[PDB]
Structure 1
């Protein structure tokens, strides 16, 4: 049985997006919150229709379609997808993912009837990634320096934000964050990281080490 999301939560989320913007970490946290239970295509579509303006909504429809197409390519590349079945008769078409298949167009009850839980979670993850892309697109890591008066946790927050919300591949973020900690982060912390008796191979470990041995001031 389909239950709609509260319009009160949706109104609060829309005002959050209106004041804080699309890219603030609080906004992404709120979206993750309202993206907790697996939503039907109807739910996510109406949610993005309400919280996003017209042009961001067009961009988001595009990005969601592209991500769903990547998902369907991975699905035809592996017959063991939680959305797929074992036989060929359970293969999931994009009409079933976007809610365009037969018995689903405009009807959320029938949608919830025919859809699989794997289908729902795949649609939800696709929509979240599309939202991230559009947010990064609507509004530079290599220009980030630690200010003379700025603390180190603020600098690390800003740098990790700008590196993860950028065009780098996922497998290239940690080395870049480390090498930016080492070359930015004004020469006191540079020498503090350089003279590390242990080898630090993770941004979290570097942050912990620097927070331990930092010059209290």
Structure 2
């Protein structure tokens, strides 16, 4: 993090207490939990310098996820630089050709920046910072989606002893965290409620005097009329 003061942009590091809490969050909840992504968005609020994001991912991520994240961050930054050479009005670019932003300046590899966060904060633009930050966030999302797969939705059955809300949670999780289009999730969730969800609940849904046309309505109906046991 940088503070743009009168003397110039002064760099302030992130608290190691927040970083330790975020690292333990990633350690217990995993990379893909919505609470973890919310915490990352929180610590991704102010535009960070390449040094900050690099050290942050070095600390919170293990070695192999860190390698994957470096790869993904490079790819996303390259897409950004292609869009930048496709539009001279990038908030990282300038009007003349002398302000064109090279990947050495984005990854912090340019002259006067390697290993020095103060000089980094000096030469970098705010548009550069926000582009780097958005790129790093998208790369984190990619790596998180890659490190742990969503479980195959079509293999999910309600166990003989499992409750129905746990089964519904697991199924909705695996269906929404999958490769289906957004407009195909609700019908699939409904038809999986009807064919999975062991034959007692199957018959309970089948003999519904009303027509249930939404996963929430099916869940409410089943929770009302379920066999207390």
Shorter chain as normaliser: what TM range?
0.7 to 0.9
Deviation at 1:75, TM superposition (A): 1.2
Runs of 4+ in 1 over 2 A off after TM superposition: 140-217
203-212 or 87-96, which deviates more: 203-212
Judged with a 3 Å threshold, the aligned counterparts in structure 2 of structure 1 residues 51 and 169 are, in CA distance, closer, same or farther, namely farther
Deviation at 1:4, TM superposition (A): 0.3
Question: Is this contact kept in 2: 1:39–1:124, CA < 8 A?
Answer: yes
Structure 1: distance between partners of 2:124 and 2:206? 54
Structure 2 gap segments, 5+ residues each:
1-9
Question: For each residue in 1:46-103, what CA deviation from the matched residue of structure 2 results, as whole angstroms up to 9, or x when unmatched?
Answer: 0000011111111111111111111111111111211111221111111011000111
Judged with a 3 Å threshold, the aligned counterparts in structure 2 of structure 1 residues 40 and 199 are, in CA distance, closer, same or farther, namely farther
Judged with a 3 Å threshold, the aligned counterparts in structure 2 of structure 1 residues 107 and 181 are, in CA distance, closer, same or farther, namely farther
Deviation at 1:197, TM superposition (A): 17
Judged with a 3 Å threshold, the aligned counterparts in structure 2 of structure 1 residues 128 and 151 are, in CA distance, closer, same or farther, namely farther
Judged with a 3 Å threshold, the aligned counterparts in structure 2 of structure 1 residues 58 and 212 are, in CA distance, closer, same or farther, namely same
Judged with a 3 Å threshold, the aligned counterparts in structure 2 of structure 1 residues 39 and 182 are, in CA distance, closer, same or farther, namely farther
What TM-score do you get using the length of structure 2 for normalisation? 0.69
Residue 181 of structure 1: aligned partner: 193
Question: Is this contact kept in 2: 1:41–1:99, CA < 8 A?
Answer: yes
Question: For each residue in 1:143-200, what CA deviation from the matched residue of structure 2 results, as whole angstroms up to 9, or x when unmatched?
Answer: 5678999999978865665456445688998998899899999999999999999999
130-139 or 181-190, which deviates more: 181-190
What TM-score do you get using the length of structure 1 for normalisation? 0.73
Question: Is this contact kept in 2: 1:136–1:166, CA < 8 A?
Answer: no
Q: Quick check: which has more Rg, 1 or 2?
A: 2
Structure 1 gap segments, 5+ residues each:
none
Structure 1: distance between partners of 2:125 and 2:182? 29
